[PDB]
Amino acid sequence: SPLMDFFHSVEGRNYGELRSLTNETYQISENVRCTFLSIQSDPFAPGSQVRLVCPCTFSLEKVLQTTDLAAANPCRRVAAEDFILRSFHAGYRNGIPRRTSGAVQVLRPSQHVLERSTVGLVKEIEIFARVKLPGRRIDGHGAIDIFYNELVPLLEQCVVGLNEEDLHQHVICVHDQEELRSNLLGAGYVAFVANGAILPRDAGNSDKPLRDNAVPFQSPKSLECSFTLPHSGKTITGMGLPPGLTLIAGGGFHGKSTLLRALEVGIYNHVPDDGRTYVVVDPTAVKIRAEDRRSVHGVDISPFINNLPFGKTTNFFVTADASGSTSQAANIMEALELGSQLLLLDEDTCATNLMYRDALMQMLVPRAQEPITPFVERVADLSQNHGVSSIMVIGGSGQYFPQARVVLVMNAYQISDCTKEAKEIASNSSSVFIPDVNRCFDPDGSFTTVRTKVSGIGTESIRFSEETIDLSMVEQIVEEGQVNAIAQCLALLYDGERIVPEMTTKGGALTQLPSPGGVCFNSNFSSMIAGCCSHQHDKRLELRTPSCYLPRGFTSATRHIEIGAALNRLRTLRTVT
Amino acid sequence: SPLMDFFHSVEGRNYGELRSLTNETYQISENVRCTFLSIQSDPFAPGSQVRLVCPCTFSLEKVLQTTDLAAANPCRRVAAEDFILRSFHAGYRNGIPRRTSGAVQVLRPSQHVLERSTVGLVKEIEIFARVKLPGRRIDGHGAIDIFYNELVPLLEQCVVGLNEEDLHQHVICVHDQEELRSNLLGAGYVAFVANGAILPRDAGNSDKPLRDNAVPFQSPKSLECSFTLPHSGKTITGMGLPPGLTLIAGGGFHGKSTLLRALEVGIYNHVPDDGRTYVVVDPTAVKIRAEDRRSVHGVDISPFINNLPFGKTTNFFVTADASGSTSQAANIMEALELGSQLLLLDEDTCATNLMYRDALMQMLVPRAEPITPFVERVADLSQNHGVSSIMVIGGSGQYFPQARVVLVMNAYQISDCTKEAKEIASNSSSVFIPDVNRCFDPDGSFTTVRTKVSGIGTESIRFSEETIDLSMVEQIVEEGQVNAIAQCLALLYDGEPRIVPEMTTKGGALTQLPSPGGVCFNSNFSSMIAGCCSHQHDKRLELRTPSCYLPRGFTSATRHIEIGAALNRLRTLRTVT
Ligand SMILES: Nc1ncnc2c1ncn2[C@@H]1O[C@H](COP(=O)(O)OP(=O)(O)NP(=O)(O)O)[C@@H](O)[C@H]1O
Ligand SMILES: Nc1ncnc2c1ncn2[C@@H]1O[C@H](COP(=O)(O)OP(=O)(O)NP(=O)(O)O)[C@@H](O)[C@H]1O
Ligand SMILES: [Mg+2]
Ligand SMILES: [Mg+2]
Ligand SMILES: [Mg+2]
């Protein structure tokens, strides 16, 4: 009631008047309360941050399995908050807002279920928003619409008026997914692909499942295996993949890349639509690709590449313009340093030189003269002595056959288990890694340059003061709120110049890190980044550290490996050993 | 004079009266004049478009070799306007402006010399700009600063007060530079790389040459050749590449991607620093890569990929989400139909399946294997259609029997090893229709649109609600180029009915297209795109087709092939045969 009357009150009057609202809290409905987090300078300044608060109607016991909030499995708290976001957002598609100024920015959820700062379940329901409040004169009627006519009905009908059965099933599917990824290394696998999974996406620029003429994934028998889901009781069946080397071989339009992308997202749980639901991978899995002109600092790529020009150091690599082989190797070590157990390779984004060696090529120029020691030679070593496994798509090269654990053959989106035939083909055709990695972070040479503000640019980049970090090929980033999280971390690392050691220890301390779902090889770089991640988790995916330029509640969880990767490619980065 | 005397008058007054400034044209100095092409609505709005006019002081005789404007070689006209802007911009680093509002937006030219609408030479000098005229009570003093203090000294000192000896030398390098490529197909070559060239760049995110410890290009003797530049008299020497197949072989970190990138830009002339200056390629050459999830419509990918799943037609291919080989082959023909003469490949960003087939792969599963690799179509394409290929190969000597020359690179030093290489092979040892039927269908193509077309940086096109991915069309090298493409799309759309057949004709008529420097296999698609390019050229890089959201003078020339690639991968592209 009173907010409106207030606005009538200030309806004509000048814009400055608005700075009164901030902090000033009003109840706009019986079941809705509004709290003002900021009030911006003008209409065109991006949003005026507000906290929408409304009662939590559903039974915790039925959906969260406990009466007291604090006991609830965080996974289910996430799936809940995730769901509410989804429901509120769908409210626009169901013509619920009697009016749609469209000046209401609230973070849009991916197809993946991540903890987001956006909705918090507290004891109530906490939804953060950004609103473009309506000439120089104020125009209260605009706002008046915006709250009473657009937000209240959406809240009351899609948020307060939730559907419990839907909620409960959301949460059950999600949780069963987490648990099912928690069962992986135990059950004997590194990846599991559920039967009937609709892997292929809707469009090359789309993440939703394929509506038309999808072919449900079917595991070969020899690779078939089953599980029991705890919360649904549903028992499911599919393709299990042992530790070691999984080869995905077929030449054509067959589905190879499509399966693999499923596996990269395999570290996520997605809304029951997604159709990749219950395709799961080790939660530390990393899409490994050549990436070029990326900068490297302090990575020891010496396992793969041996003989740089001009006696330049393999063992502590450093460039601001990297090669396809060198940076791919850079990414493999970058990864191991952050502790990945399952590398994911799509050969078409991989640096052929790294991958294998041609006879003609070696005889043309002697391999003594060639630096590179290809991946095939390091792979058996990595699985046997390190428990690091690889799944990779190979297009037309059987060189990997003596090393291959399984050889898959994809044809028109159908798989066959051809591991026997292939190693038979191989047949008739016939460690090196330091886990304790000496890499500390140097905030001095790293941050000397800058002049600030830190902010996430879409899904692609980080505005880091005058600097700009390119994540366009950190392919497992799948939300804007993720890169935003990363921005929070960077602005933190920057702001407190006690923290590197402090976070390094904060990290060495931990036994398990948070998955982006909420559920819980070393070095000081690694461990530090773990410290940052962990601290961020602590403060509810919202560090506020001063140099950060971010709205309240547009942040999504992300693995520590991603914060790793983002710093890892700061091109002002400096690092010591 | 009069402008400021106006402004203070206004300075209390409301922003609106700035709508008086429209059209009204003022002289803020002897050698300066400004014309207001627009006025922003708001202080925020991206700026207010103005024409900056100043006298042409230099002797046209020495620089353009004619007293009369209209005779001037457009190559030297471009190099002129290029140089003018460049100095103007340099005016900021030389402490020239008295004040620095930074409300002045004027296109930043790249290292490339391109025709740009920004500076025009007419009879004088024409520079287009965008200004943010500053509380929302007018900031008359602020504006006064922008013009009396910032723009004028820049103009008078760096533009009116230009340096003719440099400008002359600019133009000589540029012109001599264009001529050197015109000489290429004649002199018997497809690529020429000048000795002493500095190929590599300062940083993975930078286009400027490698300042520190660059190693100068040197041609192997066997491939060495020389030319004579008409305008400088200078005689230059380097690496000549014949028609046919050139293989770039090597190990790692030796500079192949460096050389190749130089060759991709080889369709451009660079400001005399750039250091790739006098590296030239066929001005039609295209960087061919696997581009995944790109949409295809109407491409006959048949020569490489003869089979698909489900009787899907290779001969008229269509996907909204695409494969590495499938996309790459689309690219090869997309480019062929637009008339490429040299295909440029980095075996790394190429889809390997398209490139060779392993013995082991072929046996494990027989080829009766959609794909027919490039190695087989290469001789054919060369011999029968005069389309050549230079490609970086990482470790596969399979191409050796097909190889014209085999280049071996080692620590930034090339060697001719084609003898030894083909021996290696010896020791271990048409299809394409030029007449491709592809008409453009504006009906199905433009149905879903409500508009506005605007280029997003260098990377994408906001085509109404649609978005086009130019992120892997690697030879786009300016924002003004993407803006150009946006102009053309806005044209095909707004002038929809008669513009397709008309441009098709307007393009069949043409025996030469305009190179981006200004100097001057068929299908209706192609001929149409050529029509668009040529009409754009005619119209001075300013087609204000009505649905174009663009400031005046933020446009740069492109090849026709580029406009081809953008339309080509529109996700609502419908095309008929
Ligand atoms: N199981 C499926 N059902 C329906 N469509 C599919 C399926 N799998 C893949 N697709 C579509 O097939 C197209 C090509 O599949 P893709 O995943 O690229 O095969 P691929 O092996 O990567 N070929 P390549 O990378 O060229 O060697 C993509 O558009 C997919 O969306
Ligand atoms: N003339 C030069 N002077 C100095 N540095 C150079 C020169 N040419 C190349 N480089 C460096 O080498 C890198 C490019 O070479 P690169 O692409 O690694 O060769 P490559 O071995 O063919 N690639 P790959 O085989 O895929 O690893 C750049 O990052 C440059 O820094
Ligand atoms: Mg390279
Ligand atoms: Mg390379
Ligand atoms: Mg693919």
CSV table of N, CA and C in Angstrom, one decimal, chain B residues 3-104:
chain,number,residue,atom,x,y,z
B,3,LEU,N,29.6,30.0,-32.0
B,3,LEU,CA,29.1,28.8,-31.3
B,3,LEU,C,29.2,28.9,-29.8
B,4,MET,N,30.3,29.3,-29.3
B,4,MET,CA,30.5,29.4,-27.9
B,4,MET,C,29.6,30.5,-27.3
B,5,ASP,N,29.5,31.6,-28.0
B,5,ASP,CA,28.6,32.7,-27.6
B,5,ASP,C,27.2,32.3,-27.5
B,6,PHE,N,26.8,31.3,-28.4
B,6,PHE,CA,25.6,30.7,-28.3
B,6,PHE,C,25.5,29.8,-27.0
B,7,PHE,N,26.5,29.1,-26.8
B,7,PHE,CA,26.4,28.0,-25.8
B,7,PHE,C,26.2,28.5,-24.5
B,8,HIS,N,26.9,29.5,-24.1
B,8,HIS,CA,26.8,30.0,-22.7
B,8,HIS,C,25.4,30.5,-22.6
B,9,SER,N,24.9,31.1,-23.7
B,9,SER,CA,23.5,31.5,-23.7
B,9,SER,C,22.7,30.3,-23.2
B,10,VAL,N,22.9,29.2,-23.8
B,10,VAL,CA,22.1,28.0,-23.5
B,10,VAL,C,22.2,27.4,-22.1
B,11,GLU,N,23.3,27.7,-21.4
B,11,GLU,CA,23.9,26.8,-20.5
B,11,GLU,C,23.0,26.4,-19.2
B,12,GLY,N,22.2,27.4,-18.8
B,12,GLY,CA,21.2,27.0,-17.9
B,12,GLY,C,20.2,26.1,-18.6
B,13,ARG,N,19.8,26.5,-19.7
B,13,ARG,CA,18.6,26.0,-20.4
B,13,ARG,C,18.6,24.5,-20.5
B,14,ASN,N,17.4,24.0,-20.9
B,14,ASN,CA,17.2,22.6,-21.0
B,14,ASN,C,17.9,22.0,-22.1
B,15,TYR,N,18.1,20.7,-22.0
B,15,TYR,CA,18.8,20.0,-23.1
B,15,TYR,C,18.1,20.1,-24.4
B,16,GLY,N,16.8,20.2,-24.4
B,16,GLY,CA,16.1,20.2,-25.6
B,16,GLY,C,16.6,21.2,-26.7
B,17,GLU,N,16.8,22.4,-26.3
B,17,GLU,CA,17.2,23.4,-27.3
B,17,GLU,C,18.5,23.1,-28.1
B,18,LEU,N,19.0,21.9,-27.8
B,18,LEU,CA,20.2,21.5,-28.5
B,18,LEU,C,19.7,21.0,-29.8
B,19,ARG,N,18.4,20.8,-29.9
B,19,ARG,CA,17.8,20.5,-31.2
B,19,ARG,C,17.8,21.7,-32.1
B,20,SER,N,18.3,22.8,-31.6
B,20,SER,CA,18.5,24.0,-32.5
B,20,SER,C,19.8,23.7,-33.3
B,21,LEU,N,20.8,23.0,-32.7
B,21,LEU,CA,22.1,22.8,-33.2
B,21,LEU,C,22.2,22.0,-34.5
B,22,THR,N,21.1,21.3,-34.8
B,22,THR,CA,20.9,20.4,-35.9
B,22,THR,C,21.2,21.2,-37.1
B,23,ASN,N,21.9,20.6,-38.0
B,23,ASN,CA,22.1,21.1,-39.3
B,23,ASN,C,22.9,22.4,-39.3
B,24,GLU,N,22.6,23.2,-38.3
B,24,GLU,CA,23.3,24.5,-38.2
B,24,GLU,C,24.7,24.2,-38.1
B,25,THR,N,25.5,25.0,-38.9
B,25,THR,CA,26.9,24.7,-39.1
B,25,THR,C,27.7,25.9,-38.7
B,26,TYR,N,28.8,25.7,-38.0
B,26,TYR,CA,29.5,26.8,-37.3
B,26,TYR,C,31.0,26.6,-37.7
B,27,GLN,N,31.7,27.7,-37.6
B,27,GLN,CA,33.2,27.8,-37.8
B,27,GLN,C,33.7,28.1,-36.4
B,28,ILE,N,34.5,27.2,-35.8
B,28,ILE,CA,35.1,27.4,-34.5
B,28,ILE,C,36.5,27.9,-34.6
B,29,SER,N,36.9,28.1,-35.9
B,29,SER,CA,38.3,28.6,-36.2
B,29,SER,C,38.3,29.0,-37.7
B,30,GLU,N,39.4,29.6,-38.1
B,30,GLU,CA,39.7,29.9,-39.5
B,30,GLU,C,39.7,28.5,-40.2
B,31,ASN,N,40.7,27.7,-39.9
B,31,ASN,CA,40.8,26.4,-40.7
B,31,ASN,C,39.9,25.3,-40.2
B,32,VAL,N,38.9,25.6,-39.5
B,32,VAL,CA,38.0,24.6,-39.0
B,32,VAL,C,36.5,25.0,-39.2
B,33,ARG,N,35.7,23.9,-39.4
B,33,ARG,CA,34.2,24.1,-39.5
B,33,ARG,C,33.6,22.8,-39.1
B,34,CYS,N,32.4,22.9,-38.4
B,34,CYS,CA,31.7,21.7,-37.9
B,34,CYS,C,30.3,21.7,-38.4
B,35,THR,N,29.8,20.6,-38.9
B,35,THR,CA,28.4,20.3,-39.2
B,35,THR,C,27.6,19.3,-38.5
B,36,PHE,N,26.5,19.7,-37.8
B,36,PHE,CA,25.8,18.8,-36.9
B,36,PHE,C,24.8,17.9,-37.7
B,37,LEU,N,25.2,16.6,-37.9
B,37,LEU,CA,24.4,15.7,-38.6
B,37,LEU,C,23.3,15.1,-37.7
B,38,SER,N,23.4,15.2,-36.4
B,38,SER,CA,22.4,14.8,-35.5
B,38,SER,C,22.6,15.4,-34.1
B,39,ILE,N,21.6,15.3,-33.3
B,39,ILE,CA,21.7,15.7,-31.9
B,39,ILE,C,21.1,14.7,-31.0
B,40,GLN,N,21.8,14.2,-30.0
B,40,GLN,CA,21.3,13.2,-29.1
B,40,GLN,C,20.0,13.7,-28.4
B,41,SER,N,19.2,12.7,-28.0
B,41,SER,CA,18.1,12.9,-27.2
B,41,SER,C,18.4,13.2,-25.7
B,42,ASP,N,19.4,12.6,-25.2
B,42,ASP,CA,19.8,12.5,-23.9
B,42,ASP,C,21.3,12.7,-23.8
B,43,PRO,N,21.7,13.0,-22.6
B,43,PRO,CA,23.1,13.2,-22.3
B,43,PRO,C,23.8,11.9,-22.5
B,44,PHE,N,23.1,10.8,-22.1
B,44,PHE,CA,23.6,9.5,-22.3
B,44,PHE,C,23.8,9.0,-23.7
B,45,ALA,N,22.9,9.4,-24.6
B,45,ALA,CA,22.9,8.7,-25.8
B,45,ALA,C,24.2,8.8,-26.5
B,46,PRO,N,24.5,7.8,-27.3
B,46,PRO,CA,25.9,7.4,-27.5
B,46,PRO,C,26.7,8.5,-28.1
B,47,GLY,N,26.0,9.5,-28.7
B,47,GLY,CA,26.6,10.7,-29.0
B,47,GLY,C,25.9,11.4,-30.1
B,48,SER,N,26.4,12.6,-30.5
B,48,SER,CA,25.7,13.4,-31.5
B,48,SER,C,26.6,13.6,-32.7
B,49,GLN,N,26.2,13.1,-33.8
B,49,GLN,CA,27.0,12.9,-35.0
B,49,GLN,C,27.4,14.3,-35.7
B,50,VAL,N,28.6,14.5,-35.9
B,50,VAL,CA,29.1,15.8,-36.5
B,50,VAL,C,30.1,15.6,-37.6
B,51,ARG,N,30.0,16.5,-38.6
B,51,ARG,CA,31.0,16.5,-39.7
B,51,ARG,C,32.0,17.6,-39.4
B,52,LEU,N,33.3,17.2,-39.3
B,52,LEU,CA,34.4,18.1,-39.1
B,52,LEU,C,35.0,18.3,-40.5
B,53,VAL,N,35.1,19.6,-40.8
B,53,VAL,CA,35.5,20.0,-42.1
B,53,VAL,C,36.7,20.9,-42.0
B,54,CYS,N,37.8,20.6,-42.8
B,54,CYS,CA,39.0,21.5,-42.8
B,54,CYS,C,39.7,21.5,-44.1
B,55,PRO,N,40.4,22.6,-44.4
B,55,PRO,CA,41.0,22.7,-45.7
B,55,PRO,C,42.1,21.6,-46.0
B,56,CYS,N,42.4,21.3,-47.2
B,56,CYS,CA,43.4,20.4,-47.6
B,56,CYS,C,44.7,21.1,-47.9
B,57,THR,N,45.6,21.1,-47.0
B,57,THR,CA,46.8,22.0,-47.2
B,57,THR,C,47.9,21.4,-48.1
B,58,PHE,N,48.0,20.1,-48.1
B,58,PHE,CA,49.2,19.5,-48.8
B,58,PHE,C,49.1,19.6,-50.3
B,59,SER,N,50.2,19.5,-51.0
B,59,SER,CA,50.2,19.5,-52.5
B,59,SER,C,49.8,18.1,-53.0
B,60,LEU,N,48.6,18.1,-53.6
B,60,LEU,CA,48.1,16.8,-54.2
B,60,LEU,C,49.0,16.3,-55.2
B,61,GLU,N,49.7,17.2,-55.9
B,61,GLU,CA,50.6,16.8,-57.0
B,61,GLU,C,51.7,15.8,-56.5
B,62,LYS,N,52.2,16.0,-55.3
B,62,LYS,CA,53.4,15.2,-54.9
B,62,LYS,C,52.9,13.9,-54.3
B,63,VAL,N,51.6,13.9,-53.8
B,63,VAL,CA,51.1,12.8,-53.1
B,63,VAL,C,50.1,12.0,-54.0
B,64,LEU,N,49.3,12.7,-54.7
B,64,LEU,CA,48.3,12.0,-55.5
B,64,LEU,C,48.5,12.0,-57.0
B,65,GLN,N,49.5,12.7,-57.4
B,65,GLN,CA,50.0,12.7,-58.8
B,65,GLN,C,48.9,13.3,-59.7
B,66,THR,N,48.1,14.2,-59.2
B,66,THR,CA,47.2,14.9,-60.1
B,66,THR,C,46.8,16.2,-59.4
B,67,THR,N,46.6,17.3,-60.2
B,67,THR,CA,46.1,18.5,-59.7
B,67,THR,C,44.6,18.4,-59.3
B,68,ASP,N,43.9,17.7,-60.1
B,68,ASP,CA,42.5,17.5,-59.9
B,68,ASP,C,42.2,16.3,-59.1
B,69,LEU,N,41.3,16.5,-58.1
B,69,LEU,CA,40.9,15.4,-57.2
B,69,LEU,C,40.5,14.1,-58.0
B,70,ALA,N,39.5,14.3,-58.8
B,70,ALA,CA,38.8,13.1,-59.4
B,70,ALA,C,39.6,12.2,-60.2
B,71,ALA,N,40.8,12.5,-60.6
B,71,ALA,CA,41.7,11.6,-61.3
B,71,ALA,C,42.5,10.8,-60.4
B,72,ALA,N,42.8,11.3,-59.1
B,72,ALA,CA,43.6,10.6,-58.1
B,72,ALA,C,43.3,9.1,-58.0
B,73,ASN,N,44.4,8.3,-58.0
B,73,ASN,CA,44.3,6.9,-57.8
B,73,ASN,C,43.7,6.6,-56.5
B,74,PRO,N,42.5,5.9,-56.5
B,74,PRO,CA,41.8,5.6,-55.3
B,74,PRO,C,42.7,4.9,-54.3
B,75,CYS,N,43.7,4.2,-54.7
B,75,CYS,CA,44.7,3.6,-53.7
B,75,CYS,C,45.3,4.7,-52.9
B,76,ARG,N,45.7,5.7,-53.5
B,76,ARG,CA,46.4,6.9,-52.9
B,76,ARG,C,45.3,7.7,-52.2
B,77,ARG,N,44.1,7.7,-52.6
B,77,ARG,CA,43.0,8.4,-52.0
B,77,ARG,C,42.7,7.8,-50.6
B,78,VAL,N,42.7,6.5,-50.6
B,78,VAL,CA,42.5,5.7,-49.4
B,78,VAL,C,43.7,6.0,-48.5
B,79,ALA,N,44.9,5.7,-49.0
B,79,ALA,CA,46.1,5.9,-48.1
B,79,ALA,C,46.2,7.3,-47.6
B,80,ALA,N,45.7,8.2,-48.3
B,80,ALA,CA,45.6,9.6,-47.9
B,80,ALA,C,44.7,9.7,-46.6
B,81,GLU,N,43.4,9.3,-46.8
B,81,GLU,CA,42.4,9.4,-45.8
B,81,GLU,C,42.8,8.6,-44.5
B,82,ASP,N,43.4,7.4,-44.7
B,82,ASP,CA,43.9,6.6,-43.7
B,82,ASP,C,45.0,7.4,-42.9
B,83,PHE,N,45.9,8.0,-43.6
B,83,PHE,CA,47.0,8.7,-42.9
B,83,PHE,C,46.5,9.9,-42.2
B,84,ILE,N,45.5,10.6,-42.7
B,84,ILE,CA,44.9,11.7,-42.0
B,84,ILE,C,44.3,11.3,-40.7
B,85,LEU,N,43.5,10.3,-40.7
B,85,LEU,CA,42.9,9.9,-39.5
B,85,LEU,C,44.0,9.5,-38.5
B,86,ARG,N,44.9,8.9,-39.0
B,86,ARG,CA,45.9,8.3,-38.2
B,86,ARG,C,46.6,9.4,-37.4
B,87,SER,N,47.0,10.5,-38.1
B,87,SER,CA,47.6,11.6,-37.4
B,87,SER,C,46.7,12.2,-36.5
B,88,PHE,N,45.5,12.3,-36.9
B,88,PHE,CA,44.5,12.9,-36.0
B,88,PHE,C,44.5,12.2,-34.6
B,89,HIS,N,44.4,10.9,-34.7
B,89,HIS,CA,44.4,10.1,-33.5
B,89,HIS,C,45.7,10.2,-32.7
B,90,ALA,N,46.8,10.3,-33.4
B,90,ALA,CA,48.1,10.4,-32.8
B,90,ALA,C,48.2,11.7,-32.0
B,91,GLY,N,47.4,12.7,-32.5
B,91,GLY,CA,47.3,13.9,-31.8
B,91,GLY,C,47.0,13.8,-30.3
B,92,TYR,N,46.4,12.7,-29.8
B,92,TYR,CA,46.1,12.5,-28.4
B,92,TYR,C,47.3,12.2,-27.6
B,93,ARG,N,48.2,11.4,-28.2
B,93,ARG,CA,49.4,10.9,-27.5
B,93,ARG,C,50.5,12.0,-27.5
B,94,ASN,N,50.4,13.0,-28.4
B,94,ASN,CA,51.4,14.0,-28.5
B,94,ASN,C,51.1,15.2,-27.7
B,95,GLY,N,50.1,15.1,-26.7
B,95,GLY,CA,49.7,16.1,-25.9
B,95,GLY,C,49.2,17.4,-26.6
B,96,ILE,N,48.7,17.2,-27.8
B,96,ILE,CA,48.1,18.2,-28.6
B,96,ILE,C,46.9,18.9,-28.1
B,97,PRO,N,45.8,18.1,-27.7
B,97,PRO,CA,44.6,18.8,-27.2
B,97,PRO,C,44.9,19.5,-25.9
B,98,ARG,N,44.3,20.7,-25.8
B,98,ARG,CA,44.4,21.5,-24.6
B,98,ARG,C,43.7,20.8,-23.4
B,99,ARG,N,42.6,20.2,-23.7
B,99,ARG,CA,41.8,19.4,-22.8
B,99,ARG,C,41.4,18.1,-23.3
B,100,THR,N,41.0,17.2,-22.5
B,100,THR,CA,40.6,15.9,-22.9
B,100,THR,C,39.3,15.3,-22.4
B,101,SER,N,38.2,15.8,-23.0
B,101,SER,CA,36.9,15.4,-22.5
B,101,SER,C,36.7,13.9,-22.7
B,102,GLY,N,37.1,13.4,-23.8
B,102,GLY,CA,36.9,12.0,-24.1
B,102,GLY,C,35.5,11.7,-24.3
B,103,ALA,N,34.8,12.7,-24.8
B,103,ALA,CA,33.4,12.6,-25.3
B,103,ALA,C,33.4,12.5,-26.8
B,104,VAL,N,34.6,12.5,-27.4
B,104,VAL,CA,34.8,12.5,-28.8
B,104,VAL,C,35.1,11.1,-29.4
